[PDB]
Design a protein around this ligand. Structure first.
Ligand SMILES: Nc1ncnc2c1ncn2C1O[C@@H]2COP(=O)(O)O[C@H]2[C@H]1O
Ligand SMILES: Nc1ncnc2c1ncn2[C@@H]1O[C@@H]2COP(=O)(O)O[C@H]2[C@H]1O
Ligand SMILES: Nc1ncnc2c1ncn2[C@@H]1O[C@@H]2COP(=O)(O)O[C@H]2[C@H]1O
Lengths: 208, 205
């Protein structure tokens, strides 16, 4: 740890080879199907990784945040496509560099490949969990897990009745696979089970 | 890039530091929950990567084959646990190595980390549509989609009425995350729906 701020010059070395660019909230950094030729690094902000179906429904594969790489999957063979959309959820600052350039950096210092790889490992772990949720739990179950997750981060909040979070009906729906209005119906149901206290900023009692 | 008497120096080098053990079908290579300290590579055979619900219901994350690393997700951070179960589909020949050893190898030649990484990238790419479906489709939609997928595989046989496939009730269940019984019921519905013929094999449309 560099304490609160863990920057390390490996990072700064890395970053000095990139151009940093800003993106307002809801800007799309990456479009599914685009040719993959560029790697991103999130200096500031957080993003949504999402996929769409044939009707236009969107679901969230993951949230990523500062310190996270993005656009890394097309890096090990060329001629690939972006596997998903990536959208800024907040204002963002993101470093970017060509794949060839990045491939060059690796030669010099493979610890950058190690750090990237370690992120991919974590993503697969997390995907495995998310897959059991989606495959086994019913839409209420997925919603409760979700809540229980959003609250399990240092970006959440605290409260006598537990921890509070800032999430919307569309958000949750995109994470569990259901409408806006279903979520509302299910969030009322849980409040009723005195599982939560909602108000735009949900209050998860916490325990599971 | 040479490699006789088969596949490259870099992998032959890597295997000589492994120990190769033999797994019979249905045997478990990797148990979920367990401390991760070693890496595997499949020399021969195929395995199933899977997870289960509270009541043992099974969901296949992926099949893996000869050439595939297994057990890698624990390598990058200490104290990780196995994210899923891994079971021999067929008899397997599996090389195995400790993470500590593998990391020294990485020091000697980062090529081997590149090849490992390329596979993890692939595994995230392929899981993306599949995870999409879990949210977009219910079990029936997912069962239909699976049959469609299966019928577009190279191993699908032509049929005068369409494409014939070989798959059991339980593999479908394992593919969509439901019981073999549920699969039997829904296959019958799709049948009555004149979408498929279900019998000694499955004929899609
Ligand atoms: N199975 C599903 N059923 C309905 N909406 C879904 C499903 N999977 C993902 N979604 C969606 O997630 C969004 C949540 O908010 P909306 O109701 O505005 O629109 C919804 C669609 O984009
Ligand atoms: N399951 C996932 N979890 C986290 N990020 C993901 C997942 N699937 C894809 N991504 C990403 O979103 C990016 C889309 O472009 P790439 O495929 O080039 O690189 C991808 C990763 O950054
Ligand atoms: N989505 C996936 N695709 C392919 N293999 C996977 C996936 N998720 C997990 N695996 C694996 O199965 C192993 C379970 O143990 P590990 O978590 O150590 O390492 C894991 C990988 O080898």
């Amino acid at each position: 740890v560099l304490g609160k701020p863990q920057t390390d010059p490996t990072l700064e070395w890395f970053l000095s080879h990139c151009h940093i660019h800003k993106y307002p909230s809801k800007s799309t950094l990456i479009h599914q199907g685009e040719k993959a030729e560029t790697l991103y690094y999130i200096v500031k902000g957080s993003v949504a990784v999402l996929i769409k179906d044939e009707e236009g429904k969107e679901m969230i594969l993951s949230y990523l945040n500062q310190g996270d790489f993005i656009g890394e999957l097309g890096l090990f063979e060329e001629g690939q496509e972006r596997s998903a959309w990536v959208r800024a959820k907040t204002a963002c600052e993101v470093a970017e560099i060509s794949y060839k350039k990045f491939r060059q950096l690796i030669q010099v210092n493979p610890d950058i490949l190690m750090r990237l790889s370690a992120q991919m490992a974590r993503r697969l772990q997390v995907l495995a969990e998310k897959v059991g949720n989606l495959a086994f739990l019913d839409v209420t179950g997925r919603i409760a897990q979700t809540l229980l997750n959003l609250a399990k981060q240092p970006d959440a909040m605290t409260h006598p009745d537990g921890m509070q979070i800032k999430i919307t009906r569309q958000e949750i729906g995109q994470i569990v696979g259901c409408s806006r209005e279903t979520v509302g119906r299910i969030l009322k149901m849980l409040e009723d089970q005195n599982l939560i206290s909602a108000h735009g900023k949900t209050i998860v009692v916490y325990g599971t």
